[PDB]
Structures are given as C-alpha cells and as structure tokens.
C-alpha cells in the first residue's frame, strides 16, 4: 500500500516531463519529423 501510494507520484512526474519535452513534435508533409523550430529530428518517421 505504501509503494503504490508513493511511487504513483514518481511516475506521474516522469510522464509530465516527457510530455513537455515532446509535445511540439509533428510529422510534416515531406515525411520529415520536426519540432516547432523546424529542426529535423528524424528524416523519416520511425525510419519506415
């Protein structure tokens, strides 16, 4: 009961930082994967 009650907030914080790191990443019409600055993260999404 302690573990479930404690470690739920540990993983809740993990998910929050992950979402903010990745939220602006979108597939564009040329197949590239880019963020809001237009930086290329992958030249083709999922490599396939």
């Amino acid at each position: 009961l302690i573990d479930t009650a404690v470690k739920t907030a540990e993983t809740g914080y993990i998910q929050r930082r992950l979402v903010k790191a990745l939220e602006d990443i979108m597939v564009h019409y040329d197949g590239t994967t880019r963020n809001s600055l237009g930086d290329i993260i992958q030249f083709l999404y999922g490599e396939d």
């Binding site: 009961l1 302690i2 009650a5 404690v6």
Partner: protein
C-alpha cells in the same frame, strides 16, 4: 510555581530607598463550569446547553496572588481565565448525576467523553508522537560528508517535561580521508564545534590519563585507543582549566568584548546549565557530567568500530505519545509567560503614578481564554501571530458519522513528519508495533503509515515520580559514582534512571 515570583527594583534617589515590588503566585482553585449571561446571573452549565448555543464548556480558574513591599533606605483570588473541561472527566458536571438524571440532561449514556466543546463544536486532541528525550542515539552519515557517525541527544527536564536544548557529538573523518580523525562536539548557543578533550578539561578534569579513564573501560582495546589518539594531540596545547573555559566563551554567540575576567564566567553558565540539564543544575556536581560525557564517547566509538549496530529510529521503545495532559501543559506554559509579561509591563506604568493597583485591573483574562480557545479551535499550536512554523492538526472536529468511528477517532495517534520526505522508514509497520498499535487500521493516501491507532489493550503511562525509585536502589546496595574505577570495576553493571547515569551495582542478578 515554575517562575514563582515577579520582582521589581528602584534605587530611590529623587535618601536612597530601594523599593522592591514583589508578587507571589500561590494556590490554584477550580470551580465547576458556569454560564454567565449578559444579565450577570450565573448557573451551572451542562454540555447540552453548551452545544446548542455555541458556547465553550469551560471552568473559571482563580489564582492566589500575594503582594509584598520591601523598602530599604540605603492579594486574594484573582481570576486568570477559563480552561475548557474534558467531558466525563473529574471536573465535568456529568461525572456525578447518576444514570437516572443523565437522561434529564439530554446526555447519552453511551457517550464516553474524552473531547472538548469549543464554540459548540466537539474537538478531540490527537496524540502526538515524538522521539524520547534523554536517550543517546547513534546514526551513520552519508558518503559526501566528512562525518561518518553522529551521537545525538535532546535534553529535557523531568519536572514539567519540557524541551530545553539539543546536543550532538560528531566523528569527523571519512574512510582513509579526513586525515586526523578527531572528535568535536556541538554545544547550545556556541557557533562552532569544539573538540572533546577541551570540554573535558573545561569541566575540571585536565590530565590525559584521567580523561581516558573516564571514557574507555578496557585498557587492552588498542583500536579504540588509536582512534582517540588524534583527539589528544589536537587539544594538547590547551593545558589547564582557565584557557579551556576561555576558548569556549570566545565562540558562544555573545557580544564582542566581555574580557577573560568575565568571558569565563559566562561560559561557566553555558556548561552548568543548557549542557545536559537533565542530570543536574546545582553547583558543585560536575562529576556527573564528566562521567556521562565519557559514556557518550564510548558509545560513539563502539558504533564506529562496528561492534554495535546503529540505533533503529523506529524502535517503539524509543518513542513517546503526547496526550491531552502534556500537550496542554506546554501550551499553558507559553501563555502564562505572556500573561506574566503583560503584568510586568503594566506595573512599570501604574507605579509611576504611585497608586495602589487593584490587582483585578492588572490581570486580563482574555490572554489565556482566547489563547486556549483559538488553538483548540484551529489546531494551530502556538501564538496566533506565529501560525506558520507551529504544528497544525493537533485538534480536529470529532467524527460522529457512526459509533465505531467515534471510538477510533478518540484513540488516534499522529506522527508529525510530513508529506515531504518520501522513503519508507517512518511509514513501515515495524516489528515492535506488535500489540501496541493496530497492524491493520491506517488511512489510504498521503497519511498512510504515519497516522496509527492504539491496539485494544494498550495504555499510556500517566507519569510517576522518580524520587522513590532512587531511595529503593540505594537501600539495596547501589554504590555512588565517586566510588567507581574501571580498574576495580571492570565488570559491574551501570544503572540508569530516566536516562541519567546514577550509580553502579556489582551483583545485578539479585537486584
């Protein structure tokens, strides 16, 4: 009687005539709870009226005060406030009556009391868990620290039971890092850590050979003796009492410029009182503190030598529960000083008029009455202006949803550690909880494992005077501390009474 007299003075030159004004507090008397209408009429208050009309069920408290007037050419029952009465206690008007008349007062015979009534709302005090006072605990320290082991103690008096100060003994030096592995202590109201040997010398025992005879009781133990080696050499140049006491005073948070002729006499107070005050505070008894200090260092090194585990902070024998009694005394103490200073500040103006003060005009009962009411109503444990830093949640509205819930709520205990600090150690069900707190009953969520509930057959010690126990020990063969030598007593058992080393006995089995 903790501060039994107020004293003023003026050296009359205006034919000098020292006129000390003195006020002495005497006997306490209690009256049954009384409702005083705006009319002025009074009657005995019973709880059912108190709930309905949002009143406070409380008893007026009267205190004898005595005036005296020293003059050298060279009162009665004043009312101090109202104290809320716990229902069904000995001072509640329901304790008598008897079953027939209980029904007429609209009181239910299944209601077992144990709670207060504040502005019509039923408030119960939650037992507060704290660490025991006057016990030595040894803990290990984390890797990025020059300290590896620490001994700690919070000293608290027996009378009243109240906190005084806290003291630590730290062992510096990491594993093959920290060079000289010496030991310094921490003293209340001194800014810097002071090596152990210096404080031994500062108490009146100066040659090395006596110092080591007070700590280690095994001349063969060369490992322990090697670890005390750097402590001797780092405090060698302090070779007598006077320069030791002055070395202390030059750090103790005072003012700049109190000179050696007096800076000693200021440090002698920091050693006589505040440092281990639970042993004694009268003069000419420094033999007990020196012997006790040696015990601490001995315990510190046993853990550092891996001959004894570090103490388990969760062992229930090292814990205490503060219930209604002790909690009210600590709050009443704070408020009674506040009332005292308002009397003192009022005398300095009312005596410049040279007019006999009518006493009843120098005791404002709102200080205690509003103080107790506010803290019991909100749970904020302290003066109202200091609501933060004070502990919250000590008083709570009594849950009356069902009968079982009332029983549980009156038997609840709280550990005030927080929600800050994850880990597990204060939250786990420790083995020593067996038979003392319930293994099943604990809240879900943030309080899980910190709020506990007393097992069905548990009880709480009310407290007992230690003085009859001392008399019994000396009558059956306990020998004083001045007669004790590790060469002669290489095998006898040490005897502790409330954490102070008081004697030694050679045949413990019969005792």
């Amino acid at each position: 009687w903790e501060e039994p007299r107020l004293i003023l003075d003026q050296p009359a030159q205006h034919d000098n005539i020292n006129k000390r004004y003195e006020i002495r507090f005497g006997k306490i008397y209690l009256s049954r709870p009384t409702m005083t209408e705006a009319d002025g009429t009074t009657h005995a208050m019973f709880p059912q009226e108190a709930r309905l009309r949002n009143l406070t069920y409380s008893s007026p408290v009267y205190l004898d005060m005595e005036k005296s007037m020293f003059t050298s050419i060279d009162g009665n029952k004043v009312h101090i406030g109202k104290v809320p009465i716990m229902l069904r206690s000995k001072f509640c008007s329901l304790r008598t009556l008897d079953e027939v008349d209980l029904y007429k007062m609209k009181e239910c015979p299944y209601d077992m009391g144990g709670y207060f009534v504040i502005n019509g709302s039923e408030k119960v005090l939650i037992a507060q868990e704290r660490s025991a006072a006057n016990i030595v605990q040894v803990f290990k320290k984390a890797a990025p620290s020059p300290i590896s082991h620490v001994a700690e103690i919070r000293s608290a008096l027996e009378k009243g039971s109240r906190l005084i100060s806290t003291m630590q003994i730290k062992l510096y030096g990491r594993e093959d890092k920290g060079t000289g592995r010496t030991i310094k202590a921490t003293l209340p109201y001194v800014k810097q850590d002071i090596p152990i040997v210096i404080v031994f010398r500062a108490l009146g025992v100066v040659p090395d050979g006596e110092i080591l005879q007070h700590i280690c009781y095994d001349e063969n133990d060369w490992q322990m003796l090697e670890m005390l080696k750097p402590c001797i050499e780092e405090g060698f140049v302090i070779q007598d009492k006077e320069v030791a006491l002055d070395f202390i005073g030059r750090r103790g948070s005072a003012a700049l410029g109190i000179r050696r002729e007096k800076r000693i006499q200021y440090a002698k107070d920091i050693l006589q009182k505040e440092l281990l005050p639970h042993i004694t505070q009268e003069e000419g008894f420094e033999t007990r503190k020196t012997f006790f200090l040696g015990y601490m260092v001995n315990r510190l090194l046993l853990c550092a030598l891996e001959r004894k585990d570090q103490d388990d902070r969760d062992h229930f024998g090292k814990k205490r529960l503060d219930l209604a009694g002790p909690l009210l005394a600590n709050l009443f103490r704070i408020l009674f000083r506040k009332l005292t200073r308002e009397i003192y500040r009022y005398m300095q103006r009312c005596i410049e008029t040279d007019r006999d003060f009518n006493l009843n005009l120098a005791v404002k009962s709102t200080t205690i009455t509003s103080g107790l009411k506010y803290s019991l109503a909100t749970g904020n444990w302290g003066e109202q202006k200091k609501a933060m830093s004070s502990r919250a949640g000590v008083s709570q509205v009594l849950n009356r949803y069902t009968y079982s819930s009332t029983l549980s709520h009156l038997r609840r205990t709280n550990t005030p550690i927080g929600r800050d600090g994850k880990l597990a150690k204060p939250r786990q069900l420790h083995n020593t909880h067996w038979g003392l707190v319930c293994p099943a009953e604990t809240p879900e969520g943030q309080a899980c494992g910190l709020v506990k509930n007393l097992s069905l057959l548990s009880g709480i010690s009310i407290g007992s005077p230690s003085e009859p126990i001392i008399n019994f020990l000396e009558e059956w063969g306990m020998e004083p501390l001045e007669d004790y030598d590790p060469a002669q007593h290489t095998k006898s058992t040490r005897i502790f009474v409330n954490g102070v080393w008081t004697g030694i006995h050679r045949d413990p089995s019969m005792l």
